[PDB]
Amino acid sequence: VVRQVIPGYTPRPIRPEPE
Amino acid sequence: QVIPGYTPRPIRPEPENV
Amino acid sequence: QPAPAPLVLRVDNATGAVDVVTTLREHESSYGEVVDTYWLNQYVLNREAYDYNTIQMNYDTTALLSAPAVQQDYYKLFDGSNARDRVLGNKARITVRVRSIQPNGRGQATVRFTTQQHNSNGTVEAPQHQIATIGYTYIGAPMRSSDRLLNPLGFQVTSYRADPEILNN
Amino acid sequence: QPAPAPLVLRVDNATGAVDVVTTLREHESSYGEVVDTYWLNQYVLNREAYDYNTIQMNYDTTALLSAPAVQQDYYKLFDGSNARDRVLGNKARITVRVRSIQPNGRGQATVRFTTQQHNSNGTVEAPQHQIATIGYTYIGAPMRSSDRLLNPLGFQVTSYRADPEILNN
Amino acid sequence: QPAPAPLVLRVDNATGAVDVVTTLREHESSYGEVVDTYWLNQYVLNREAYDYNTIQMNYDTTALLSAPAVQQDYYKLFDGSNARDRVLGNKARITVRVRSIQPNGRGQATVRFTTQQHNSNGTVEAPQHQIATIGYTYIGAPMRSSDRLLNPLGFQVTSYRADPEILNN
Amino acid sequence: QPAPAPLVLRVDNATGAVDVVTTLREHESSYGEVVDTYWLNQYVLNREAYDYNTIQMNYDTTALLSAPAVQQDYYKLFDGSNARDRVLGNKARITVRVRSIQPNGRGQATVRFTTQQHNSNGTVEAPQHQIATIGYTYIGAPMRSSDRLLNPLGFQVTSYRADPEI
């Protein structure tokens, strides 16, 4: 009944590659 | 009672990184 | 005989910000009156802050404490050429601290906080002052171990807008 | 039933000096560029901005920081078929930010700010530039908890107008 | 005329925080069974972990979620020549993550977690596995803004130990 | 009709400096630890100081903070041919500042202070050093608007002397 659930989105951590 | 209290750690005072 | 005095107003000489100094008052009004301030604090701090080393948890936590509309607004801050992940990356970091939160109604509160940028050359930018307005509710306990160990209460932001001061602030 | 008028012990942030209640209630209670620019900012932002989810607080705050004449002008913006409540409703929202405020006299200041419209389809309208002229005073501390926790200083707008900025650059 | 009640206030010259000399006000009080576990899990992650840059908050939080006996055991880890502050200092850091927590009785739970050391030369030590046994209770809501915004539930560790896990797999 | 209580007393946490608001900090009808310090200072400064332009307030304030015996001793300083009103008049003025006050017992404190004379020709006399001994109590809140807005605490000097410091 709630449907109370969190969202869906791209990952929170992504690679910190050097350059 | 609850007696909330502390003498906590110096948070702000970091030392001389050599 | 009982008489009541007034909370004095504190005026910040640098920001002109007026803070009410409570007179012998530490009263908590109700369940979630101060519990709500915790969630609002943790939400703003994690949302606004950044550190390459810890952001994955703050990122997922923010999403966990956000309505899908809000989650998308947040996710987008890490997209494109101006992404926080590219602008700050592992060269600069953001430190956030909340000074005071005061609920004002039916799923709404005001968060007064500051933010500053630190970097790899050992320098620090002047701190800025910001105020967030948070619309919120609770969706009850989540049903995944990865969610309940972060947001057991079900805190959820349904609307979010933080505005920095103009010029100096 | 009327009690001691709320007294603000103004505290200097640089020196820690403590001020007391004054004739500022029967004068401009808000004092100091820093302090006045804050109130002028918060007034314009909350007055001009709109979000179905937070407007009740911005609405009441605007009224709290407005002379009855001004309050009525404001209230009317939410009336009739062209009401902000019907035009924006829960389909579109307004974001407002102040760039700079400079006092110019005896209860008067100029506020330079911008505004933009966002909506439910995920689009954003081009931002507009506006300038507000605010006539104001201070009425001293209010005597209700619901007012002192929002406007302890007594800021009050006595006259208000805001026109489009023409970017003749 | 009753003698004017003595009036006195203290102003913090560093924080601009103004506080009345008179004793403050009490808050709300209700007992929630699932409050100790959440506080204990947050305290454990802050306690075992270390980062020169964030430790002041983890340090104070751990103390906030610890009985004085426990607080002292914790404080001592930062003392002497072998202090975490000197051993790790700003040369090395500790990352901690909890895999699973299962309550087992009347103020007692088992925490299964891992830990690893990172450093300034960009290297990482092999991760270790550890298990904590936590004895705990709740002391109800605290009566200071600096405490309620961190541990509103009153979580408190009354006994703590953590041993290496032997991976006899 | 309603009556009024004390407003606030300033005590800088960093400097320990004491600032008095228009509503005088109450001594709670007792010598106090800081109540004697602020009241003892304001008493000595106003009593010993003089300026044709502000003396009416300092004069009335001193009396407000003095037992009738003390008030009379004070009033007499403005009497006769050697009256402060004739000697200083509007030709010379006295500036007074307190350096330190330390309570020593049961209604008694020592005030260490200085004083100097300035005049209409723009000159200044060498400053002098003096020490006052003040016997005091508190009589509780007064019941007149003209008194409560000056001495809400009821501070009252019951004995007073001040000698040159050597």
Author numbering:
A (entry chain I): 83 to 101
B (entry chain H): 86 to 103
C (entry chain E), D (entry chain D), E (entry chain F): 63 to 231
F (entry chain G): 63 to 228
Quoted passage from the original study:
Conjugative type IV secretion systems (T4SS) mediate bacterial conjugation, a process that enables the unidirectional exchange of genetic materials between a donor and a recipient bacterial cell. Bacterial conjugation is the primary means by which antibiotic resistance genes spread among bacterial populations. Previously, we solved the cryo-electron microscopy (cryo-EM) structure of a conjugative T4SS. In this article, based on additional data, we present a more complete T4SS cryo-EM structure than that published earlier.
Thus, only three TrwG/VirB8 periplasmic domains (TrwG/VirB8peri) in the asymmetric unit (18 total) could be located unambiguously. However, density was observed on the side of the TrwG/VirB8peri ring, a density that could not be interpreted at the time. In the hook, one molecule of TrwG/VirB8peri could be fitted based on secondary structures (region number 5, right-most panel). The newly observed MolD makes only very few contacts with this trimeric unit and is not related by symmetry with any of the other 3 subunits. However, it appears stabilised (and therefore visible in the density) mostly via interactions of its connector sequence (between TrwG/VirB8peri and TrwG/VirB8tail, residues 63 to 94) with the corresponding connector sequences of the other three subunits.
